[PDB]
Write an enzyme that holds these catalytic residues in place. Structure first.
Site, PDB file in Angstrom:
ATOM      1  N   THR A 148     -57.230 -35.107  11.301  1.00 30.30           N
ATOM      2  CA  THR A 148     -57.269 -33.752  11.809  1.00 30.30           C
ATOM      3  C   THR A 148     -57.258 -33.828  13.313  1.00 30.30           C
ATOM      4  O   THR A 148     -58.209 -33.413  13.968  1.00 30.30           O
ATOM      5  CB  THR A 148     -58.548 -33.057  11.361  1.00 30.30           C
ATOM      6  N   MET A 223     -52.413 -18.691  14.261  1.00 26.97           N
ATOM      7  CA  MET A 223     -53.757 -18.176  14.200  1.00 26.97           C
ATOM      8  C   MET A 223     -53.982 -17.260  15.361  1.00 26.97           C
ATOM      9  O   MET A 223     -53.354 -17.404  16.407  1.00 26.97           O
ATOM     10  CB  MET A 223     -54.731 -19.345  14.243  1.00 26.97           C
ATOM     11  N   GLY A 232     -66.996 -27.653  18.384  1.00 26.40           N
ATOM     12  CA  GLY A 232     -67.542 -27.870  17.068  1.00 26.40           C
ATOM     13  C   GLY A 232     -66.571 -27.325  16.051  1.00 26.40           C
ATOM     14  O   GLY A 232     -66.662 -27.628  14.861  1.00 26.40           O
ATOM     15  N   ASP A 235     -64.761 -30.000  14.091  1.00 29.08           N
ATOM     16  CA  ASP A 235     -65.647 -30.597  13.104  1.00 29.08           C
ATOM     17  C   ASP A 235     -65.854 -29.738  11.853  1.00 29.08           C
ATOM     18  O   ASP A 235     -65.869 -30.245  10.720  1.00 29.08           O
ATOM     19  CB  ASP A 235     -66.964 -30.907  13.795  1.00 29.08           C
TER      20      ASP A 235
HETATM   21  N1  LIG Z   1     -59.815 -20.314  20.606  1.00 26.70           N
HETATM   22  C1  LIG Z   1     -59.501 -20.301  19.311  1.00 26.70           C
HETATM   23  N2  LIG Z   1     -58.849 -19.236  18.790  1.00 26.70           N
HETATM   24  C2  LIG Z   1     -58.517 -19.183  17.468  1.00 26.70           C
HETATM   25  N3  LIG Z   1     -58.824 -20.231  16.676  1.00 26.70           N
HETATM   26  C3  LIG Z   1     -59.489 -21.317  17.123  1.00 26.70           C
HETATM   27  C4  LIG Z   1     -59.813 -21.373  18.518  1.00 26.70           C
HETATM   28  N4  LIG Z   1     -60.432 -22.517  18.712  1.00 26.70           N
HETATM   29  C5  LIG Z   1     -60.497 -23.202  17.565  1.00 26.70           C
HETATM   30  N5  LIG Z   1     -59.892 -22.459  16.583  1.00 26.70           N
HETATM   31  C6  LIG Z   1     -59.774 -22.891  15.124  1.00 26.70           C
HETATM   32  O1  LIG Z   1     -60.656 -23.964  14.815  1.00 26.70           O
HETATM   33  C7  LIG Z   1     -59.949 -25.182  14.560  1.00 26.70           C
HETATM   34  C8  LIG Z   1     -60.274 -26.173  15.683  1.00 26.70           C
HETATM   35  O2  LIG Z   1     -59.148 -26.303  16.513  1.00 26.70           O
HETATM   36  P1  LIG Z   1     -59.219 -27.184  17.835  1.00 26.70           P
HETATM   37  O3  LIG Z   1     -59.315 -26.301  19.050  1.00 26.70           O
HETATM   38  O4  LIG Z   1     -58.006 -28.071  17.886  1.00 26.70           O
HETATM   39  O5  LIG Z   1     -60.453 -27.874  17.570  1.00 26.70           O
HETATM   40  P2  LIG Z   1     -61.157 -29.102  18.197  1.00 26.70           P
HETATM   41  O6  LIG Z   1     -60.443 -29.156  19.639  1.00 26.70           O
HETATM   42  O7  LIG Z   1     -62.558 -28.830  18.293  1.00 26.70           O
HETATM   43  O8  LIG Z   1     -60.798 -30.271  17.280  1.00 26.70           O
HETATM   44  C9  LIG Z   1     -58.489 -24.812  14.418  1.00 26.70           C
HETATM   45  O9  LIG Z   1     -58.035 -25.006  13.085  1.00 26.70           O
HETATM   46  C10 LIG Z   1     -58.372 -23.341  14.767  1.00 26.70           C
HETATM   47  O10 LIG Z   1     -57.802 -22.590  13.730  1.00 26.70           O
HETATM   48 ZN   LIG Z   2     -62.314 -32.331  17.911  1.00 25.92          ZN
END
Ligand SMILES: Nc1ncnc2c1ncn2[C@@H]1O[C@H](COP(=O)(O)OP(=O)(O)O)[C@@H](O)[C@H]1O
Ligand SMILES: [Zn+2]
Ligand SMILES: Nc1ncnc2c1ncn2[C@@H]1O[C@H](COP(=O)(O)OP(=O)(O)O)[C@@H](O)[C@H]1O
Ligand SMILES: Cc1ncc(COP(=O)(O)O)c(C=O)c1O
Ligand SMILES: Cc1ncc(COP(=O)(O)O)c(C=O)c1O
Ligand SMILES: [Zn+2]
Lengths: 312, 312
Positions: A148, A223, A232, A235
């Site tokens: 992921t 999204m 988080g 995670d």
């Molecule tokens: N700012 C945001 N707006 C909409 N969805 C988000 C946002 N941040 C995280 N997500 C959601 O949560 C998950 C984490 O994405 P990501 O930002 O790549 O996470 P991380 O960087 O913590 O691994 C994604 O699947 C997404 O759909």
């Molecule tokens: Zn991460």
């Protein structure tokens, strides 16, 4: 769920907040999975905060624990979930652990969250020592069944840089090539078909039929972007992703849909309260941006589908 | 519940199993409380197993975390729940911490589980270093608002030994005297009015009206004993106790009833599976006796009342 599924999650722990095992344990639990938690670190909060103090574990501290489990003959899992670590030694050892386990249980699935850095404010920088990139790249991804990664992290692993959906799709092909059969880029900059106010996530899956044929699944998702930087989320994602794919091992679309939907709900709930504690025309602080997990219990248990995955 | 209640729980953490914060966090969470967890220790499993390896925290490590929270200004709680520690330094500091918080917030409630030993096989022995008895006895109990002692521990604190219900009721009086206004002996040998196959638990509560009068509550309960030795039960109790008394601050009977009921269910579920994995005429091992938390999610949320407390 009703079957007996045990998951050995190895990630960070924060006293306050939802990040690391703190953000992964609840979901899997309210979802029915029996979790075995090893905390790679114990900090006051997540490094997104101005200050953070705490402690970390090294290869020996991890050995002690597993040895403990080992000694009692309770080292038997169905899944393995790994995340935040700042110790290359620690990470390396997990791989060895994961493998001994895969020897015992060839049916074991190892979900790997290549937690290394953040793709914010354009291109990025890692938030963990550099010595882990190599370890993740050469010892971990090889043995992972599901990754992921971050657009950033995902670029970091395949050593490239994305600048198009395709280019993205290639990294997933490539990543697969390194080991994982299920690959997901939780998000990226790709000029979404609609709005700059939309996060895109790509998920690839590859299966080999008992007839030799390789059935391939490719899905893209748009999204709704939240005007904030949470920590988080990744995670929580993997942890829930681990639960849905278990339900739909051959339905990356569906598994990802539930997953990202729960994601949306949780997040919408968070930003709402967040903006409440911050006030109008004031930006929520990392403290005020902590995920409202507990409050989202029901949404995690049964998230209504609010994002429809497009099948490429 | 539907109000903003934060709880700073400071207890042990086990990779596998339900004990320490592992047994306390889920309940409070599915119950609605916002939890802040500090893990006094991280072991493979609980010391009830033949082997156990892991690490421990010392006053400095706890300071780090607290300072961390301190520095960000998030050291604000509504409750405090404390348990398993092997470090007297750790325990002591916890107190200082408790006080600094009680100053900031006079409405704060501190639930203290005097975890020190086991009253099994007749008279017991502590499962922690002795240097804690004094600390618990002189610095902790004084400042506690609710204690959930072990007949054993309870004896240990009040320095006596129970051999009658009375003897018991006295110790609670004695305990209160030391500080707590709500006191509960989660269990003891007292020749239950019915069956040797019944555990007895006594709960005392004392309140000071705005008119000077002191309203006193005294309740005894007969629980159905399970043919086994579980570990973590205590911790589960306190955590849930912390949740019902919050709902019924003046209904020790009711608060106790729900809690103990949940207890029964959870436990009944556990021994059932346990005996399944062990087989007929074979005793469940400590590993096979781990509480079935997750599986009891619903019962925890709303436990049917299966024990009726008698109001002495
Ligand atoms: N700012 C945001 N707006 C909409 N969805 C988000 C946002 N941040 C995280 N997500 C959601 O949560 C998950 C984490 O994405 P990501 O930002 O790549 O996470 P991380 O960087 O913590 O691994 C994604 O699947 C997404 O759909
Ligand atoms: Zn991460
Ligand atoms: N063998 C048992 N039979 C019935 N109830 C039990 C048993 N063991 C624990 N419990 C329940 O769990 C709670 C924990 O109590 P206790 O065992 O005395 O504490 P601790 O786990 O701290 O020694 C008890 O108050 C009781 O309600
Ligand atoms: C301790 C810790 N764990 C986990 C994360 C993961 O954050 P995310 O899942 O939002 O990328 C971070 C940042 C962190 O500091
Ligand atoms: C690590 C650990 N935590 C907590 C406990 C507490 O057990 P109980 O709730 O049965 O008193 C024990 C024993 C233990 O070994
Ligand atoms: Zn106890």
């Amino acid at each position: 769920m009703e079957e007996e599924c045990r998951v050995l999650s190895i990630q960070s722990h924060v006293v306050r907040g939802y990040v690391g095992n703190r953000a992964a344990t609840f979901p899997l639990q309210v979802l029915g999975f029996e979790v075995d938690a090893v905390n790679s670190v114990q900090f006051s909060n997540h490094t997104g905060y101005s200050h953070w103090k705490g402690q970390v574990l090294n290869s020996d501290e991890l050995q002690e624990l597993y040895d403990g489990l080992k000694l009692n003959h309770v080292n038997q899992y169905d899944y393995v979930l790994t995340g935040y670590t700042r110790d290359k030694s620690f990470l390396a050892m997990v791989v060895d652990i994961v493998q001994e386990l895969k020897q015992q249980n060839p049916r074991l699935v190892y979900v790997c969250d290549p937690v290394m850095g953040d793709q914010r404010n354009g291109e990025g920088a890692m938030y963990v020592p550099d010595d882990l990139l190599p370890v993740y790249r050469e010892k971990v991804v090889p043995v992972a069944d599901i990754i992921t990664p971050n657009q950033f992290e995902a670029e970091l692993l395949t050593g490239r840089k994305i600048h198009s959906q395709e280019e993205a799709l290639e990294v997933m092909d490539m990543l697969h090539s390194m080991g994982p059969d299920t690959v997901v880029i939780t998000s990226s900059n790709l000029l979404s078909p609609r709005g700059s106010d939309y996060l895109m996530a790509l998920g690839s899956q590859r299966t080999r039929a008992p007839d030799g044929s390789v059935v391939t699944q490719r899905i893209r998702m748009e999204m709704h972007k939240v005007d904030a930087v949470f920590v988080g989320t990744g995670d929580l994602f993997a942890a829930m992703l681990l639960a849905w794919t278990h339900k739909h091992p051959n339905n990356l679309k569906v598994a990802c849909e539930k997953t990202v939907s729960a994601m949306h709900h949780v997040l919408q709930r968070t930003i709402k309260c967040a903006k409440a504690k911050s006030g109008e025309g004031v930006k929520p602080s990392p403290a005020q941006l902590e995920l409202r997990m507990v409050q989202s219990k029901k949404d995690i248990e049964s998230p209504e589908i609010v994002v429809q995955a497009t099948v490429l």
